[PDB]
Design a protein around this ligand. Sequence first.
Ligand SMILES: Nc1ncnc2c1ncn2[C@@H]1O[C@H](COP(=O)(O)OP(=O)(O)OP(=O)(O)O)[C@@H](O)[C@H]1O
Ligand SMILES: Nc1ncnc2c1ncn2[C@@H]1O[C@H](COP(=O)(O)OP(=O)(O)OP(=O)(O)O)[C@@H](O)[C@H]1O
Ligand SMILES: [Mg+2]
Ligand SMILES: [Mg+2]
Lengths: 122, 21, 52, 193, 242, 520
Amino acid sequence: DAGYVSQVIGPVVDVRFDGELPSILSSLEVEGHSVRLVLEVAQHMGDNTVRCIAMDSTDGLVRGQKVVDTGSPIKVPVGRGTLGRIMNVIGEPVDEQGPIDAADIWSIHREAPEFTEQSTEQ
Amino acid sequence: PAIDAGYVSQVIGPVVDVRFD
Amino acid sequence: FAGVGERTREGNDLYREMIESGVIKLGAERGNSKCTLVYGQMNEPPGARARV
Amino acid sequence: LKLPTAPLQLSGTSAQIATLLWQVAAKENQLDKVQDELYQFIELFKQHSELRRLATDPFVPTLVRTKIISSVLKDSGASEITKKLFEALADEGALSALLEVTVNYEELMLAHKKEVYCTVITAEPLDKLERVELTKKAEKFVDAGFKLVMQEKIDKKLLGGFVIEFSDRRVDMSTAKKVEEFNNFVNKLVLSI
Amino acid sequence: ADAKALDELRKPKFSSKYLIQHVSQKLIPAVKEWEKSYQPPVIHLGRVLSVGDGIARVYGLKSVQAGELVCFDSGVKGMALNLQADHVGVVVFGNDSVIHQGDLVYRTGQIVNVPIGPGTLGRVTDGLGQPIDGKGPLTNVRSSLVEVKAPGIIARQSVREPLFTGVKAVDALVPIGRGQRELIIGDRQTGKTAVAIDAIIHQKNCNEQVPKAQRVYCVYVAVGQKRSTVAQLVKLFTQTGA
Amino acid sequence: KALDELRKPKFSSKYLIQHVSQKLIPAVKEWEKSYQPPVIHLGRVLSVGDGIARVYGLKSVQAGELVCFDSGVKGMALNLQADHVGVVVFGNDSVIHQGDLVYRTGQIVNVPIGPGTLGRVTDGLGQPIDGKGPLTNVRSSLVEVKAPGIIARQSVREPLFTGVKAVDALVPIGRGQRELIIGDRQTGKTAVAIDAIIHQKNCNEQVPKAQRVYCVYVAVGQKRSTVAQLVKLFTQTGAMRYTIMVSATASDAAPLQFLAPYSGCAMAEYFRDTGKHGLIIYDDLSKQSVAYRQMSLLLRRPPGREAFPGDVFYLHSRLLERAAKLSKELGGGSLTAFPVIETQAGDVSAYIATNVISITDGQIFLETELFYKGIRPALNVGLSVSRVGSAAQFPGMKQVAGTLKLELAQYREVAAFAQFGSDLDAATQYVLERGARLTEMLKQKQFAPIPIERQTVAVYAATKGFLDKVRVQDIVAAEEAVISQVNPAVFKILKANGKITPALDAHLKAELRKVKLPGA
Ligand SMILES: Nc1ncnc2c1ncn2[C@@H]1O[C@H](COP(=O)(O)OP(=O)(O)OP(=O)(O)O)[C@@H](O)[C@H]1O
Ligand SMILES: Nc1ncnc2c1ncn2[C@@H]1O[C@H](COP(=O)(O)OP(=O)(O)OP(=O)(O)O)[C@@H](O)[C@H]1O
Ligand SMILES: [Mg+2]
Ligand SMILES: [Mg+2]
């Protein structure tokens, strides 16, 4: 269920899951770190191992630290509750005004809309 | 003189590899 | 405002300028604010600067 | 801590496993037991498909491969050396390196058993005075006190004589190359003289 | 290690049977008790060995043709470009996130097809031929290869008949024949699409004056532009009648 | 044949024998009684070379954790690979052998910071090399720290007076921005930074304790004799009690040169976190990027443009973003960074030069063509930007700085027209000679910082034509005559009141009329 870190090189962390790998672009939470570190799966390496890019600094990562999957991309607090707040990249308040009100919680990765749903109104 | 007498392992131009026991 | 990878100093300048001009409102009148700042400035490692 | 030295040095990353295996089985003096066990595992890979599926398939998890190699090698009087070797080689997916760790182990044991091979290829079946006169001329090519064995092959292309195949040097004492170097030696003089 | 010392293990050389006799009866329940943690072995099928940046390396696929449309079990198609010794490196037509390490890849037996014919005249398709304007699937159309061979030396005649572009400088200085590969080169925002669209509108205008064999049907290929620019070109061609 | 699938090996690892030998050497029956080296908290060196050791073991090590070899030399665990750890070496790698033990220390990289660091010529790791003993009144903080956020900063208000007339008028520097001094070799970059240090010695004895500036000079990749001469110079002026000398020279190992500006930034962030003001000069930052390039290329990382790694923008970004002006809730401290980037024959479109220009607010482009025209400091006034602008410019200097910028802007375009000696225009000649007056006004000898009030008076006397009667060749001494022959009261009240008041601009307008100029 939970996987462990296999390799730390720079801001790129190779996480080894034993069974039922997360998808690409999925958000991974490293448990045991001091600052809340969030990994995003960039690709699958090929031997039950994904290769993630780190949102915070990798200074202080141990090989074997348990990393839990969230089954989704980076979910941010969105909506009317974010107005006047300064959000982080992982959706955290950095304006020191408390937690964010949540209209909805949306994943930051999505599709381009369509060709049909466009506006040619200059 | 078995120990502290290594043999040349490989040679690439001016770069010589010695392997020791 | 999705400030991607600029300096932190100009982000703080924008935050203070929108505090004083009436765009970002703090306190209990926060519901009348009309801007959400998103900052991924130069201090952060490039995953954060790539996804902000 | 105190490992006996291997008789001949070798290459890396598959010959090093054979060097360590010869060192450990020479500390335990089971040097021909584990060679028989590795031969048995080579033919065991040859027999069934569910065992070579543990070495060619990249979608087998390492947990079931480690537990299969432990629960199979639990019994049948297997050596501790071969058991822990196959545990360490199945934990890292290196079961396909068996076929080229055992060859370097055989080269190491052939260096130790103090026995070097050869192959004499001939045109006629050799008679017993041809053979005992062959061993005296072929022993002059080995370089120490060894146990040079003499294999026999028959090939009609030679017009008599013998060619020694030491697998690293070749002595062509045949007549078919004698007449081939004869006809080359004449035509370098007819163009000159 | 060499091959000469490695071929000689193909002959049996054990001279003892205290291992191969006993464990040959133990191995089958040992692989039976881990039947759940397996995956069914792929020979003529394909299993994804790894995936990254829109490129999936597929183990298996013993009978793909180089350039064959493979179709993943996620419903996304692929194209086997390079065939390695042990795996197949396919590309991914679209979202790579719906492909995990361990998916199944089924080959289709099709060198990459696109629907060609009279029925696709007036349609906006994507790079694979599927329509994106959304007025039903393509009717009166047939599939053909995307990588056909170019016609040879006998199969061409001299470029004689002129292609009027409707631009004064093109028809006055650099005149286009009706079989001529002509490059429209320049910098960014200089009017290359302008000359292109002017040529297309002029072939519309001239197609309603020539008798039925000199009618030239344009084709526009938008590679890497915005969806809004292609929608603007669709609205422009529809308000002109092209 | 059924044997062909297992013919060639498919290894998922490189040090496979090192994992096999941790399981075959216990298969000897006599070697089960604690005959095993532990790798839970220890580590064995596999391959040494070129200041890079690859260590098997270290299962509980952290990325960026300072480990210690059993030879005594320390090292930073940088690449945490799947089967080993790529450990850089903070010293000579001649003392390391294959099979040596690596004892991890559990600590991310630490340097002694505090008030006892003042005057201490230290390395990029913390050992003082000046021979005055260890560091006494210090505490051990981290090297790599998180930069302050968006809440933690406030607007750059108070100026940092440099003492150089070419930069205090045109390219003004506030207490808390990052100002780059970019140029070529032997163009005046280190001299501008040293003048910025020595003016803090001239200034700190006139301001209270909360307004003092404690300099930190980070000599990366320089000679040892250059830092010896600079320590001799800072002691000869007496500015060592405000200056910390962080010095990883060219003899020192490549990770020491890599970590020297980070160590210096940690030693200078103590004054920023305690309400004081700090000034740091990462001298020769290009040599720090070169040292990081070498340390990464020996660590098998794929190189990019000019064989630098990808994250070398991040290397200078996370170093420079720690220089800020904190808010009053966090102490009101400041750290003013001064990176120094050397270009090669004016290629400003290089990799590291464009990255540091993209990071920093200002830039001081010193050109090697205008250095030999007699204009020393060699400030190219056209390309130099200061993105605080007049928000942190000295008042009084703001009254004449717009005139100076506009008149030098017209003098920069009057060029390519002065080579025709009969072609008089009598209006382009006036701005053409005015630009020569202002250009030769802004010259300074080195190691001679002028206080800001005398700079404002001296440039007021030139932008208003009180040195317009002299020739173009005698303005270097007429400047000193104007500084000396005025009343000492003018500087004394101009330093105190903050601006040129209407109750002063009639006094020194007349005090320039009782001056003697050596030319008429
Ligand atoms: N002959 C012309 N007369 C007037 N305007 C023109 C002419 N040709 C082009 N333009 C104008 O120039 C602008 C750019 O034209 P166009 O989009 O064709 O350039 P482009 O090379 O396609 O740029 P890009 O390749 O970046 O899309 C358009 O807004 C168009 O209206
Ligand atoms: N105001 C000045 N007046 C006269 N000479 C100066 C002035 N400023 C600098 N110089 C001279 O210019 C030279 C500047 O050398 P500097 O200290 O800039 O070396 P650098 O360019 O930083 O590094 P490198 O030694 O690698 O070129 C010094 O030798 C100094 O004598
Ligand atoms: Mg275009
Ligand atoms: Mg210098």
